[PDB]
Design a protein around this ligand. Structure first.
Ligand code: HEM
Ligand code: HEM
Ligand code: HEM
Ligand code: HEM
Lengths: 428, 423, 423, 428
């Protein structure tokens, strides 16, 4: 089995002593192919890149979600919330069942108004810029997605558009990625706030399903503690990933003017009213295609981890023992030439025009099976709404001829991406 | 709404009583513009010609595929195959899901060797001609496309190049009709039953389960699909290669540029898969031929709900539209004034073309699943043709377009002078 | 002439070496009465506190505006703008004539829509606060007044409500000083040049000719004026709204009467121009806040010729006076004994107030040209604030007045409970 | 173009068959707005009320002074004096140039002593009234302004304070506004007197500049005939208007006690000496403001007339032909809500505290351009002196709660206005 360069008894570990580890891993996958071994002192895992192998790995009878080293550390503040629990922990399935209805079409129609509230603040911010001011794209996308999950999820206003300096969580994430005292202080700040939000609470949100909801299976509700973990979890899982998507999407649009014009024409033809309706967002088919293609190239939660439930042979060549770990490297999956063609690096939303044409397990920016993203429709609805509005209301210019530079935390975002927006002066 | 001349109680119907109805309709569209009412007794439709209205018609939340009068009559032998089924029929979505990945640009790798088998038969036929002899172009292209689907579709050899000449008899229209259906069914069902693995669509159909329902196609629907492959993707592809060759002979600087690409790219005795992907200019030539004469030149839609077309024309749920593709492809606000000229360079960058402006393969989920297959076949064959011969428009052919459910240049003949490059 | 305590060769100067000089001076005025000599090395002035002497000081044939020590130092960045120019400078009278009609109560009709834009931003900020959260009052009023002049003054958006936080750095005082001046000039001169018509003061400046000289302002003086608008009429107006809100929370029957007017008058989702003109009681509240804490609390004068003040105090040509406005506004022979009470009803009829008794906007031709602007803005915003929220003095705030060249209640915080009335 | 009610072939003419025609016209302007057409048999004119249109009308390149019907008739006794001549008549410009110096600061300082002479007689008259006697305000103001122009202008004492019955001119004016024989007799009386005053004449007056003055332009003096017309003209133009102003001003003061007290305090603080000095009068800023505000509401020469010099379009909507007439209705101009605010009817001298705030052409109680009042500084100086003295020496009481009733001749005055004066016993 292929294996990248080693560092004495550190084995491969220093390979990840970089700002950009997922990107380093993508480059190792390009030289070594569909599978390689990665050793650190005291652990091994295998990185998977081809649809052929990833599809077997997605077989829930053979493999289950693993918590990677990263996630194990995140668990210090995310506890047994959905993202950082084991499938077999009682609280995974309980919360999974309680939370599914929170992502129901009925509920999505409920959130639409609050999504529009934050989307409007974003569009007003940009209308109000002076001539030759520019926009800090990920910084503004982050303000939006944080406010949106704050408001839709627990009726709480972060008021990000009213601030330069933010509301701890990002400092907790970086440490996981004196240090002890800070970390503890950060966990505490997150906890009191959230626990205070919980204690204090009649609203159209995720916190409500959690307060008034019983798991049909066990008949038990979530206790207040798992509730806070769930709240912490929405903010870590369902905000920066969405932010990155919108930033990558705008980037690809400004780099591909013909794609921009198709999406813009769609937004003008479809978004006929001063504010978008739920139904109008569902009509933005091409914008949806742009977002999927952005996700294909730069899936913003770019890896997930698995363990073998039993001894098993992968692909008919690589035997695994019970407990062995696998990592799915999503961006390499999404660049599998045998699936997508040889032009995998080009940005072509029309790959998704006829979606049944995409083979099973070839496109996985939202994970797999019962452990896949529950926030998928929410995130796509938000992103489609916001992008539609952006393209309806402004022309965009890549005034610096920005060079793609991708910052890695748990998630991916293009750092320093800036554009200028020229208002079409269409009333909001 | 504009409307062409009427015939008392027959309304507009006698206008379609002609050998060339799509061409009649293009001419009407020239006179009346982007939209006209067409009325017949019992029924009404609206013909659309501008990108401006057609782009709304292509909105899948507002419009869905309709089976035209012609398609309703093809359904007697094509059944609930993909071409002649309604989107809401359970078998549409099942066959769609099962069949669609096996038509990827990537799936062509498995069909490539078989396409080459027939393409080599075509080239040899032409090398073996004596000096005064000429090529009957659509007759030989139909030989090729038919054998190519037979072979790629179900590992069956029509052996059209060993022959001069019942399915075609059926497309015409009421008792011989029953017997025509009979031969196709006996033939196709025997094959299905006879069938062990091949590199064909039938293999994939038998081994195929729909992700949604978890069901396979039943043997009968599978029969309908094979019939449909031939009805849908042999004559259209044949027409395309024939139109393409016509335009090339009529535009010798264009022919010379395509022949140069062919010679520069097709360096091996037979073309590889990657080499075909590299015939950029030949691809542009084919797209331009499709712009001017899309070989399935119309498709029908119905309004899913009450809606308004272009801010002007109210339609009610169930109201019909016909997209007149050759007129759309002549829309001057999209293409510029020179719409009648053959200029492959319009496709220098295919992504420069506006959404819903170029639609020779129809629309959305009801678009042609065989698009990449047809283009891979046409590019390979046309590449080989340009590599191996020079062509002469020896009669100075006068374009005459015959209409069935598809379009082809009837009587188009050429001479080929072999360049003597071996296979 | 009475005179406060001296410090050897430093005379009275060390008395001003304090965070709160105007407040120090009020306290001195309490001890010494209507007039005192204030001496520093090299210079002398006389501080006036009674309406009886101030009314003679306001006689324009006998006294003219003087640039104080503080204003002489502001002139390094404010230049020959209106605030920091001598009356006899050609540019004073030119700018005065050009600018003054564009500040009519009537000219506010054109600024009204822009004032509402910022006022709506203020209200939304507050509606969007979570339940335990509080408002930093002078910080938010400064956000509002600054953005309002930016927008009404030069169609420029400071976007202060999208921010937490170099001009203010300059008012403080000698090398960073040069760079502070630099940013303001680059910024303002670019705008002037960039500039097509807007509803702003800059438009009027560019199109404006002085009736007397027939001249326009030059681009540089125009730069000085824009700078001056912000130095003169953002902090004073900010201080006013903040003091007004302080007094309202400290006097809940007064707040309730103002809130009742607001609710009765502001019947539409946003206020119209006429409706603001109709907030009589809110206007009275603002005037009473200005009586107690006039936010530009002093102005300086010099004797145009030898003259005698109040039959007692000979002054020579060029001798200086300072009008201590908060003391004048506490003159018991004009106002009665209750001068420390907040009573808007003193302004039931503003014309009942004796000439030169109430002077928060200075005097004669050198008075504040932005008076109606400031009051229109303050009345509109305070009307909206009272319409949309109840206010709670949640810390039982202890008035602490910070002094720059203007006065504001530092650290003043409140909670707002939304009344849930839509915009 | 709006037009008030008609009377058959009399058109609008009977509208002016009233004692109070300017006031009738003001009420028509309130219903019809900034411009209306007024037809009489054989003539048309357009009445103007808004600052917007009046400012164009004041453009001397487009419009020149017209003699209205009234002025044409007055011309029967005022001849080609300044007030009733055409701009292009040789004698207008000649006399205009000769007379300008007669209104020079140097000359105004000259007149001050004679103004004080008559002002003193006015104040003595009132000191000498018995308890509970009252004052006939316009009758006394008229006695003052006639004596003042008599004495300052041509060293002639009308001695109005020594009489009940007056010194013909008013009978000549009324007729213009057996009849023939009287009119002729009146013209004659005015003429002999004046011509006698001229023949008979070493003095500090207007008659002197006229006798010893040459027009710098033509080098010609005024002949004795135009001199008499000029003398007649000072008495018709610069006496009743000034009288009306002082009467309106006192009226507004007694109706607005807070304004009275401000003006009175100013008069006591400023007029420190037994008789006012020239410089002290110039210091009466608030009294000046009171007079301007009186003039704003009730301009005592309330209309002037113009003709279009060439075809021209007024305001971009009303085309005019050469010779077309306009009337400026000054009191309506002065009530233009778009200029002054909605409280235009209130008496607020502080409108004038910061005079540069008044827009161009919004305030025109002294006419326009080269045809504006030359007696403006004289009239304001006189009125300011007299009002200051009145407010210095007496308290005033509106003992009858007088109801405003405005008599119209060429000019406006409040008829029957009476007050009681209580002496402050301050030595004169
Ligand atoms: C485009 C934006 C998003 C992307 C690309 C994304 C991607 C993913 C992926 C790949 C996983 C699987 C992780 C693993 O296997 O270890 C996941 C899980 C999860 N995500 Fe999302 N996500 C997005 C938005 C959201 C949003 C908006 C929410 C909340 C509303 C959310 C909440 C969650 C939760 C709770 C889990 C854990 C699910 C479970 O195991 O029960 N995500 N996400
Ligand atoms: C140049 C060649 C071709 C052209 C111009 C063409 C054109 C089209 C058009 C316009 C439609 C939409 C019809 C409608 O909306 O009613 C369609 C559908 C279809 N075509 Fe093609 N076609 C071509 C080649 C092929 C080939 C090679 C195959 C199969 C091997 C094929 C199979 C089909 C099928 C099954 C449908 C129905 C799809 C569905 O509705 O699910 N076609 N074609
Ligand atoms: C409540 C708010 C305000 C207060 C209390 C205030 C107070 C004053 C005072 C006391 C002066 C006279 C200074 C002196 O004699 O040295 C003055 C002058 C001035 N103010 Fe205001 N002001 C206010 C608002 C404004 C606004 C909104 C503007 C402009 C938009 C403005 C522009 C000016 C200017 C340019 C001068 C100098 C005028 C000259 O001398 O020609 N002020 N102000
Ligand atoms: C407040 C009192 C006065 C008012 C309101 C007043 C008003 C006016 C007005 C409006 C005109 C222009 C008439 C027109 O355009 O047809 C005028 C002209 C004239 N006035 Fe005055 N006036 C006053 C006092 C005086 C006095 C005191 C004198 C003499 C000393 C005087 C002498 C004249 C003369 C000679 C003209 C004609 C000027 C010319 O066209 O050359 N007026 N007056």
């Amino acid at each position: 089995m292929p294996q990248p360069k080693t560092f004495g008894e550190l084995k491969n570990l220093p390979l990840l002593n970089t700002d950009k580890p997922v990107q380093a891993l993508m480059k190792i996958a390009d030289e070594l192919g569909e599978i390689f071994k990665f050793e650190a002192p005291g652990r091994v895992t295998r990185y998977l890149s081809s649809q052929r192998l990833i599809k077997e790995a997605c077989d829930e009878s053979r493999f289950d979600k693993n918590l990677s080293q990263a996630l194990k550390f995140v668990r210090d503040f995310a506890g047994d919330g959905l993202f950082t629990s084991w499938t077999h922990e009682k609280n995974w399935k309980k919360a999974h069942n309680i939370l599914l209805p929170s992502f129901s079409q009925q509920a999505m129609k409920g959130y639409h108004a609050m999504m529009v509230d934050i989307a409007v603040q974003l569009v007003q911010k940009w209308e109000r810029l002076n001539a030759d001011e520019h926009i800090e794209v990920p910084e503004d996308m982050t303000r939006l997605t944080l406010d949106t999950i704050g408001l839709c999820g627990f009726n709480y206003r972060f008021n990000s558009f009213y601030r330069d300096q933010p509301h701890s969580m990002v400092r907790a994430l970086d440490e996981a990625m004196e240090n002890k005292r800070q970390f503890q202080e950060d966990i505490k700040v997150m906890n009191d706030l959230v626990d205070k939000i919980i204690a204090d609470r009649q609203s159209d949100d995720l916190l409500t399903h959690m307060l008034n909801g019983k798991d049909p299976e066990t008949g038990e509700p979530l206790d207040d503690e798992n509730i806070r973990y769930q709240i912490i979890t929405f903010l870590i899982a369902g905000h920066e990933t969405t932010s990155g998507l919108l930033s990558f999407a705008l980037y690809f649009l400004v780099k591909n003017p013909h794609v921009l014009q198709k999406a813009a024409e769609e937004a003008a033809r479809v978004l006929v009213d001063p504010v978008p309706s739920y139904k109008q967002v569902k009509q933005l088919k091409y914008v949806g295609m742009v977002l999927n293609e952005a996700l294909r190239l730069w899936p913003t939660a770019p890896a997930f981890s698995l363990y073998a439930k039993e001894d098993t042979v992968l692909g008919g060549e690589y035997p695994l023992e019970k407990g062995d770990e696998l990592m799915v490297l999503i961006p390499q999956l999404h660049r599998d030439k045998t699936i997508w063609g040889d032009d995998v690096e080009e940005f072509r939303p029309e790959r998704f025009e006829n979606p049944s044409a995409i083979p099973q397990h070839a496109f996985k920016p939202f994970g797999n099976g019962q452990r896949a993203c529950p926030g998928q429709q929410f995130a796509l609805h938000e992103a489609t709404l916001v992008l539609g509005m952006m393209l309806k209301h402004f022309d965009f210019e890549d005034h610096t001829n920005y060079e793609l530079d991708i910052k890695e935390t748990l998630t991916l975002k293009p750092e320093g991406f800036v554009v200028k927006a020229k208002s079409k002066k269409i009333p909001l």
